[PDB]
Symmetry: none
Subunit: 79 residues, 6 copies
């Protein structure tokens, strides 16, 4: 039941590559017992509206690595 943090190749690159994603930090990928991988990340975006637009794309990036449960914290640009 004790989770172990793994390091998926290219994941952060693909995330940084998503249109609308201005920066990525605090990416964590965990192996829960019984094969279930989850991930969290903080993502910088222009504003709340842009986040709504890119949330799906981000989730797809994770889904491409077989990851179905994510928690993404958006942080927003500050003029």
């Amino acid at each position: 039941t004790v989770p172990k943090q793994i390091d998926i190749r290219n994941l952060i690159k693909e995330l940084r590559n998503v249109e609308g994603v201005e920066e990525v930090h605090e990416l964590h990928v965990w192996q829960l017992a019984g094969s279930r991988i989850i991930a969290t990340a903080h993502i910088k975006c222009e504003d709340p509206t842009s986040y709504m637009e890119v949330a799906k794309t981000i989730k797809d990036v994770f889904h491409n690595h077989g990851i179905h449960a994510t928690t993404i914290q958006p942080e927003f640009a500050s003029v």
Copy 2:
């Protein structure tokens, strides 16, 4: 052992918060308590303000690393 019961009540209590799910509070490390949650809100208006309040709630419970995913109905 945390006080998850009280924590989730206070989180549900924050103005702008319509619903809270996928709350996880971890202290797996030799130390450092982390928390994640998903939070439903009507729309992005005052999101900055509601994010801050949520973060405060966690801080008041000694939780200082958090990742909060908002889900918005509208806007």
Copy 3:
């Protein structure tokens, strides 16, 4: 829309520039190249100081017409 190699690297390399995003370079009819970017600095004062350097970076690539949105850590 073009892709100028090294441009974003050179921009990120300018002293006082904390971050660059949303860089876009356009070719208007077969001649006039325009560029737009968001640029993070410490604060408004730092931005004023580095604006000329940033403009030079663009100028070194033949770009004379820019639209720059400054974003700030502080102030």
Copy 4:
């Protein structure tokens, strides 16, 4: 799709906006519309006040991604 001419009028019409130039609206592939503009105000303080309104003006025209260069007197 949109109307640049009406858009610029609405932008110039925002209280505190002293001048709008270099307004461009781009259609990127896959439906994504971007807009850039230079906008003059009296000073930084006035700009902060009108920034939100400007963003709304763009939003009202279905434009979600903007780059705005403020200029001052």
Copy 5:
């Protein structure tokens, strides 16, 4: 005649510290007689998180032989 250096990976290692939300304005200077000093701005969730991560950051610098640092903390929240 002091000069800026670029220690490889340093900003990566700093950004990699758990609880670091952002690093900017990193400067590493070579002072005469071999003495390397460093400055940085480091963003954290709040004061409490910063106290926890300050030691780790100091270690990161120490691993590169750097003993004298001036680190400006920036917080998402005061509290």
Copy 6:
């Protein structure tokens, strides 16, 4: 610039309990940077005095600063 007057003005700022490790550097292309460690009551006081400190430096033409608070 004048380090001596600068340090006086900094020590003079309300909330600043002590100042050490003040350095002012000239980077190429005219850009002056300054760093300092400052003793202050607590995080809240620091937020209040950060702006004042920044102003003090700005008054001397210094636009980029790194200030390390010690509480």
